[PDB]
Design a protein around this ligand. Structure first.
Ligand SMILES: OC[C@H]1O[C@@H](O[C@H]2[C@H](O)[C@@H](O)[C@H](O)O[C@@H]2CO)[C@H](O)[C@@H](O)[C@H]1O
Ligand code: NAG
Length: 431
């Protein structure tokens, strides 16, 4: 895609802090940028759309290369069109804004590069307010193995780059992404909703879901892929789990893991109020070259340090962190295939973290599964009493997009106080 000039692109500021044991925390002047899928795409020589609703203009876009040559991504009215605002340290993502639904942004080092986070033997910490983020919604904060320039160096057809939010990939190998590898994904374009469709290619990479949650339920989930970095897929390489990527991941949701009273409204982690979420990526030798061996989680709310809940499922050791053994055990216990191990488990996830990953923040609803995998019973054909089926208390009828979009359109998530750095250094304690 080309870089459009009809609307200035001004990235909202969202300061983060980088911390060390000896020196404490220092601010970085990071920014956020809207993902390319949400933007206006129009002819390079004017105002005519290349894409309207859920279809491409086959005149401007008869094939992927012609389309990318003819078509520019343009700047965004962050608040007015997308419901995205920042105070400078706190990011508010609103659900529905006019006819727009949801958003995804990436953390930027400067106006043309994503911030590349290398989090092996490091931790990532943030605050979240989910008080207005109900059943059926997901306020997500996560890492993808995107290129820092959004693919510009690799793909001559992409002249827009990170400044316009290009180059997305994730462990679901999504085929609804409009530009991949510098070409519009127009082959066999198939409508999937009023504003969305899929093409013949998907875009795959390893993904670490630090946080997917709403005020009912939360999960953290590594998803390794056998590939290294953003990879375009076709055919069965794109296929969930059996292809390049572990689509299911190895997840830790406290409720799914057998503690129904740890996290939620008025619970130990009280989701009716803001709280702090720490995630630590430990290596086997406590160096940045070691093998990722454990992902730990600590919460802090009202100044109380709250350790993660313990697993309480027959056949699963009662642990409170993600490890390769926990993953094997829960997968066996829940009857799920360990695609995670097949793709290389924590070691493969860790090599992606070591190479550097891009931070995404998003608010979304779920056309595929109604977010039931997060906050309800899932899959919908299994006995809710079987180990693993129940993930929250939201009704099994909840989360259909047309419903939440009309019922709770002013839902929002607020992400703030973003920090990363040495383990134990982004927060402190005392007696
Ligand atoms: O596809 C929806 C959702 O799947 C989660 O993976 C599931 C899964 O689909 C399932 O069959 C199983 O038993 O539990 C999983 C974990 O909730 C993914 O983690 C999520 O990213 C979505 O992709
Ligand atoms: C690595 O650090 C952990 C503390 O998180 C400690 O328990 C362990 O002994 C350390 N291991 C090595 C090899 O230093």
């Amino acid at each position: 895609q080309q870089a459009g000039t009809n609307t200035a692109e001004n990235h909202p500021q969202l300061q983060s802090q980088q911390c060390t044991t000896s020196g404490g925390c220092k601010p970085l002047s990071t920014k956020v940028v809207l993902d390319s899928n949400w933007r206006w795409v129009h002819s390079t020589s004017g105002y005519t759309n290349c894409y309207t609703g859920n279809e491409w203009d086959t005149s401007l876009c008869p094939d992927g290369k012609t389309c990318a040559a003819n078509c520019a991504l343009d700047g965004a009215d962050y608040s007015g069109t997308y419901g995205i605002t920042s105070t400078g340290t706190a990011l508010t993502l609103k659900f529905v804004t006019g006819s727009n639904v949801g958003s995804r942004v990436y953390l930027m080092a400067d106006d043309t590069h994503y911030q590349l986070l290398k989090l092996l033997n490091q931790e990532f910490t943030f605050d979240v307010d989910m008080s207005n983020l109900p059943c059926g919604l997901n306020g997500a904060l996560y890492l993808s193995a995107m290129d820092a320039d959004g693919g510009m160096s690799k793909y001559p057809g992409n002249k827009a780059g990170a400044k316009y939010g290009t180059g997305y990939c994730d462990s679901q190998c999504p085929k609804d992404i409009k530009f991949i590898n510098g070409e519009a994904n127009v082959g066999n374009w198939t409508e999937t909703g009023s504003n969305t469709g899929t093409g013949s290619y998907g875009t795959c990479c390893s993904e670490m879901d630090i946080w997917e949650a709403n005020n009912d339920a939360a999960a953290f989930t590594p998803h390794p892929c056998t590939t290294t970095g953003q990879t375009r897929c076709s055919g069965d390489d794109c296929a969930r789990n059996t292809g390049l990527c572990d689509g299911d991941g190895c997840d830790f949701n406290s409720f799914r893991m057998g503690d129904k009273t740890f996290l939620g409204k008025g619970m130990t982690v009280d989701t009716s109020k803001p709280f702090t979420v720490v995630t630590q990526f430990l290596t086997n030798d406590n160096t940045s070259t070691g093998t990722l061996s454990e992902i730990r989680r600590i919460y802090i709310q009202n100044g109380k340090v709250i350790q993660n809940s313990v697993a309480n499922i027959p056949g699963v050791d009662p642990v409170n962190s993600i490890t390769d053994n926990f993953c094997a055990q829960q997968k066996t216990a829940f009857g799920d295939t360990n695609w995670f191990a097949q793709k290389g488990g924590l070691k493969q996830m860790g090599e992606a973290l070591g190479n550097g990953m891009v931070l995404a923040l998003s608010i979304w609803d779920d056309h595929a599964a109604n977010m039931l995998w997060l906050d309800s019973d899932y899959p919908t054909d299994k006995d809710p009493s079987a180990p693993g089926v129940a993930r929250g208390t939201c009704a099994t009828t909840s989360g259909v997009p047309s419903d939440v979009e009309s019922q709770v359109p002013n839902s929002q998530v607020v992400f703030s106080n973003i920090k990363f750095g040495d383990i134990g250094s982004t927060f402190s304690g005392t007696s």
